[PDB]
Ligand binder design. Structure first.
Ligand code: XOA
Ligand code: FPP
Ligand code: 3FX
Ligand code: 3FX
Ligand code: 3FX
Ligand code: ZN
Lengths: 485, 318
């Protein structure tokens, strides 16, 4: 399985050529090349059978990472005030990393996690970055809270899922107040408009069964127009006056490319006529693979052209590769296998460069020389999972999901804000519920495609593309809100 | 020493409201006395929906301690419009916020909401500030996106003159002169030259743009930004790849620019993206076997980190 994924230790490490043209970009690129290559030279090749005497051992220090995350269930120092509006993200980064690391929480701590998030739920709709008596709802904490409840909650009266089901109408009304005529969304009252909000909203709307035609109008056009000439996607697109044309507003970036690919993929499940508007899947796959660094930079991913590799983009860029790959497969099929990125080198970057130095605080980081944090811990591990396990969207699995779906079971349909904003009839609404449910549960780990660099003790659990929670969390969560069993 | 707000006559009438996340919440943050005190009284101010000067002062104190507090930024902008405050003075305060490194999504969005509501007849002063603010970080993503919005928004109103577009390209050309690897400036050039609705699409402009691209490649043949701009340019305008090939072949080991008689020093060959150009040029000529041979060499020798991708491209041709 490693025929087209050569180890970085087996390839010659040479710097980026200068062409006798110094610049500030090259100064920083050459400095980080030295920093990453030095740490590899100090580290024993993880593909070795006997660890070399004198080198550092690159095995995944899961217990150190577990203790690093443990401080979240006691207290956080005062410098965390910059994250005081992102506490649902501190929860999600913690409970999802623990899921990936295989560490279970006891029921009392899960109850605390559920109770804390419910204090962030506003009666008018949506989750905020903190207590509802202090912060207004926001699309990004809403995603992180919904996903955290999927990880730590259950279906009992104290499980939090029941409160989510009771809030479906208000959350939907909050989503509609965020919607713009051009298809964009503000992340909150008076907030910015980008594809992070679209991604977060479409995930929650997919999981909670609150998708309507009025919610999705022009959403596909906003996202499609974010694709730049490089192949990736920018943060937003601008509508020139319904609009005569839409133009991307910045560089292709790994973060916004992830949100755009995931958003577009979620929209392909919706059975609307000539929807969603197409994207250039080939160019998106090309841009994705081009962001994987050279062996001298450990084979990690960068977020944009001529910037630096960063462990967090293992999830943002690497986790988008299965989605871009599936879109390319659909387009080639519509007109009528080796891995698409170096799955081995990405694991080597995680194990050698992204882990905190041993015997210290634990956790995973952006680069050597950077303090580890909860955000880079979650995304390094999420990207590592994508590299370890070959993920694909199986049409036969989706077909099997259609055959077992029960359209007679479900929560009350949401009341649209405009009279003609809902589905035309029950046949069309139930056909939409089936497609969205069946495709959401269509990701599989391909049997025999597993590649665990360094030995099976480095193996972590399998995350789901698009959603980024374990499949064992995704299935009972979405089944609850669709009343499937 | 610190004077609590309960010991201030200006706040004697206000009963603070405590933060309510339950008796034992997860991910708690150990706040300073100053930050907890300000949020306590802010919870009360927002509860009574007070729109006042003291509420305005309180929002500024809070966002100085946490520039990412989007709720307080929303209340602050609601305060400025309700009290008809000087939005120009608020821009001067936002200038200090960048000086003292108080930055976030929320500070940049606040500045956008200000320019939107001010709606100046000529936003040239704001364009100039954005240019200068790129000194500490020439690749700040929020800044480049804000610059895109400023030109797009005010050109929708018809307030961007031809002279303003022209000097903006002059400034963009200078940015790429200082650092031709600034992929953000390349993206800005794409807006100025290709994507913006008022752009000119003539035979001379296509020639002019192609000359700038080839010269940029010949200056920095390993610059990925120039190669991607080239591939997007030809693809967007449906231009064939074969005619330009004489300028690309020297990198694979006619009235358009050419490489130097010897290539610049520290230019190892072949350039992988030049090989990709050759392979796609072979596909354009319907020569699949020659294209598959280039992909095979990219996969096994010259771009081995993408060995799986170049192999997938090789299999498509066969
Ligand atoms: C724990 C500290 C980590 C800082 C990260 C994450 N973080 C954030 C905050 C709240 C919610 C969410 Cl979801 C993310 C940021 O604001 C800045 N970040 C710095 C970064 C690292 N590596 C790449 N970046 C650039 C980037 C910028 C915007 C976003 Br949004 C995500 C990443
Ligand atoms: C769903 C969700 C929250 C997605 C988050 C989007 C994301 C991961 C990143 C956006 C990053 C950005 C706007 C600028 C990069 O900052 P930088 O310059 O510090 O990093 P860089 O140099 O690597 O580009
Ligand atoms: O590196 S990790 O897997 O996260 C955990 C650390 O190795 C702990 N090492 C202990 C040292 C003392 C004897 C028992 C083991
Ligand atoms: O009952 S609801 O209207 O849904 C929620 C309440 O309005 C509380 N809103 C907060 C008040 C303090 C500032 C941040 C918002
Ligand atoms: O299961 S296998 O992949 O064949 C080999 C084991 O996983 C190797 N794990 C190491 C064992 C000794 C302590 C450090 C980890
Ligand atoms: Zn990062």
């Amino acid at each position: 399985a490693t025929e087209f994924t050569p180890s970085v230790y087996s390839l010659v490490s040479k710097p980026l050529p200068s062409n006798s043209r110094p610049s500030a970009t090259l100064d920083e690129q050459a400095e980080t090349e030295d920093l990453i290559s030095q740490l590899f030279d100090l580290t024993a090749d993880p593909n070795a059978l006997v660890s070399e005497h004198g080198k550092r051992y690159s095995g995944l220090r899961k217990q150190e990472h577990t203790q690093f995350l443990a401080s979240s269930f006691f207290q956080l120092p005062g410098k965390f005030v910059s994250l005081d509006a992102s506490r649902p993200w501190l929860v999600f980064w913690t409970v999802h990393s623990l899921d990936l690391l295989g560490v279970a929480l006891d029921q009392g701590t899960k109850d605390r996690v559920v109770s804390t998030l419910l204090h962030f739920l506003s009666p008018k709709g949506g989750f905020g970055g903190g207590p509802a008596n202090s912060q207004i709802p926001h699309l990004l904490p809403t995603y992180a809270s919904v996903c955290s409840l999927a990880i730590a909650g259950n279906d009992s009266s104290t499980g939090g899922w029941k409160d989510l089901a009771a809030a479906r109408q208000s959350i939907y009304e909050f989503f509609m107040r965020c919607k713009r005529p051009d298809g964009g969304f503000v992340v909150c009252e008076g907030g910015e408009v980008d594809v992070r909000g679209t991604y977060c909203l479409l995930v929650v709307a997919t999981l909670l069964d609150i998708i309507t035609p009025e919610l999705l109008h022009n959403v596909d056009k906003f996202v499609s127009a974010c694709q730049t000439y490089e192949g990736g996607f920018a943060c937003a697109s601008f509508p020139f006056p319904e609009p005569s044309c839409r133009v991307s507003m910045a560089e292709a970036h790994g973060g916004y490319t992830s949100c755009s690919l995931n958003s577009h993929f979620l929209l392909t499940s919706v059975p609307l006529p000539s929807f969603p508007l197409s994207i250039d899947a080939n160019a998106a796959l090309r841009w994705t693979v081009l962001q994987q660094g050279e062996p001298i930079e450990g084979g990690g991913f960068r977020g944009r052209t001529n910037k630096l590799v960063d462990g967090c983009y293992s999830w943002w860029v690497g986790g988008g590769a299965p989605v871009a790959e599936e879109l390319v497969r659909r387009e080639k099929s519509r007109k009528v296998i080796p891995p698409i990125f170096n799955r081995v080198a990405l694991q080597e970057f995680t194990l050698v460069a992204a882990q905190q130095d041993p015997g210290s605080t634990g956790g995973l980081r952006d680069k050597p020389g950077k303090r580890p944090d909860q955000y880079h811990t979650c995304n390094n591990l999420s990207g590592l999972s994508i590299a370890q396990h070959k993920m694909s969207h199986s049409p036969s699995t989706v077909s099997s999901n259609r055959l077992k779906f029960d359209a007679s079971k479900g929560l009350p349909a949401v009341k649209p804000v405009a009279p003609g904003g809902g589905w035309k009839n029950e046949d069309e609404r139930q056909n939409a519920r089936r497609e969205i449910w069946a495709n959401a549960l269509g990701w599989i780990e391909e049997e025999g495609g597993e590649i665990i660099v360094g030995g099976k003790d480095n193996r972590i659990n399998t995350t789901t593309p698009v959603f980024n929670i374990l499949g064992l969390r995704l299935k009972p969560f979405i089944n609850y809100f669709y009343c499937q069993e | 020493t610190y004077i609590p707000m309960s010991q201030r006559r200006s706040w004697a009438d206000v009963k603070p409201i405590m933060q309510d996340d339950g008796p034992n919440p997860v991910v708690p943050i150990m706040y300073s006395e100053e930050y907890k005190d300000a949020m306590d009284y802010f919870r009360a101010i927002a509860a009574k929906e007070e729109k006042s000067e003291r509420a305005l002062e309180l929002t500024e104190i809070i966002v100085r301690m946490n520039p990412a507090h989007y709720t307080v930024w929303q209340y602050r902008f609601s305060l400025l419009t309700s009290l008809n405050k000087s939005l120009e003075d608020e821009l001067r305060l936002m200038n200090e916020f960048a000086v003292q490194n108080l930055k976030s999504y929320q500070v940049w969005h606040h500045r956008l909401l200000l320019l939107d509501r001010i709606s100046p007849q000529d936003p040239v002063s704001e364009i100039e500030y954005i240019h200068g603010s790129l000194l500490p970080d020439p690749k700040n993503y929020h800044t480049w996106a804000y610059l895109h919005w400023l030109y797009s928004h005010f050109s929708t109103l018809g307030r961007i003159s031809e002279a303003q577009w022209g000097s903006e390209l002059d400034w963009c050309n200078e940015m790429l002169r200082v650092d031709g690897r600034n992929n953000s400036a390349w993206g800005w050039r794409w807006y100025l030259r290709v994507s913006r609705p008022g752009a000119e699409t003539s035979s001379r402009s296509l020639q002019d743009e192609l000359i700038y691209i080839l010269k940029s490649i010949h200056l920095i043949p390993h610059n990925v930004s120039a190669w991607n701009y080239l591939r997007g340019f030809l693809k967007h305008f449906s231009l064939p790849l074969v005619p330009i090939l004489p300028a690309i072949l020297p990198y694979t080991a006619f009235g358009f620019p050419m490489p130097s008689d010897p290539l610049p020093e520290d230019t190892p060959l072949p350039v992988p993206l030049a090989l990709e150009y050759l392979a796609d040029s072979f596909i354009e000529q319907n020569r699949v076997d020659d294209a598959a041979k280039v992909f095979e060499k990219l996969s096994s020798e010259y771009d081995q980190m993408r060995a799986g991708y170049w192999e997938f491209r090789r299999r498509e041709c066969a």
